[PDB]
Amino acid sequence: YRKLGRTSDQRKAMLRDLATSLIISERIETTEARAKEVRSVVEKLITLGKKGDLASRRNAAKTLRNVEILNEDETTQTALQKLFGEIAERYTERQGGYTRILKQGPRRGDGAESVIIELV
């Protein structure tokens, strides 16, 4: 696996935060290396969501941050609830994938290959 030029605690934190944000937005923009490394984490969380049993819920609560989404009509529900009620159904029949990645050109401030990781 990759280290992302960062320590262990700071990476653990970055990976879980990036996975949460992806789950919120359903497509985000970042650099290749971190997309390649958040792919597995988000894919595994969705797996914890395709079962929905209380054990998997409690276990997926480890990674996701506690965030609130305001849906249409001022309806509110958290990241766990999204994962287990709006994304489990979408991928009940698909047996992998769950994400795609679309390389983009280098950014300006660096030569970093920005990419967009999106939930498929």
Partner 1 sequence: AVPKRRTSKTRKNKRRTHFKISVPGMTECPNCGEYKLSHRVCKNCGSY
Partner RNA sequence: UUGGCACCUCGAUGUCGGCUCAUCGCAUCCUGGGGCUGUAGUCGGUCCCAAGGGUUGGGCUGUUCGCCCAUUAAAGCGGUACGCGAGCUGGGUUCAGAACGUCGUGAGACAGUUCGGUCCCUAUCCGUCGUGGGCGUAGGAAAUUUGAGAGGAGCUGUCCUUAGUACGAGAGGACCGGGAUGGACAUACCUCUGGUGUACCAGUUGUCGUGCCAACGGCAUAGCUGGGUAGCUAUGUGUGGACGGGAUAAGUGCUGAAAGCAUCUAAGCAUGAAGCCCCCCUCAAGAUGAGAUUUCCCAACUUCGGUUAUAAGAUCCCUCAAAGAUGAUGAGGUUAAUAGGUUCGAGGUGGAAGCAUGGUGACAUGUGGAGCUGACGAAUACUAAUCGAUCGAAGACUUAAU
The option from RNA, partner 1, none interacting with 108 (CB < 5 to 8 A, set by class) reads: none
User: Which is nearer to partner 1, 3 or 103 (by Cβ)?
Assistant: 103
Q: Which residue has the tokens 């989404």?
A: 69
The option from RNA, partner 1, none interacting with 90 (CB < 5 to 8 A, set by class) reads: none
Least Cβ distance, residue 85 to RNA (angstroms): 17
Give contact residues for partner 1 (rule: CB under 8 A).
Answer: 102-105, 116
User: Which is nearer to partner 1, 62 or 108 (by Cβ)?
Assistant: 108
Do 67 and 20 touch, CB atoms closer than 8 A?
yes
Q: Which residue has the tokens 């506690």?
A: 66
Distance of CA 82 to the CA centre of its chain: 12
DSSP three-state, residue 1: coil
Q: What is the SS3 assignment for 50-116?
A: HHCCHHHHHHHCCCCCCCEEECHHHCEEEHHHHHHHHHCCCCCCCCCCCEEEEEEEECCCCCCEEEE
User: Which is nearer to partner 1, 26 or 89 (by Cβ)?
Assistant: 26
2 touching RNA, by CB under 7 A? yes
Q: Which residues bind RNA (CB under 7 A)?
A: 1-4, 7-9, 11-13, 15, 32, 36-37, 39-41, 43-44, 47, 54-55, 58-59, 61-62, 66, 94-101, 103, 120
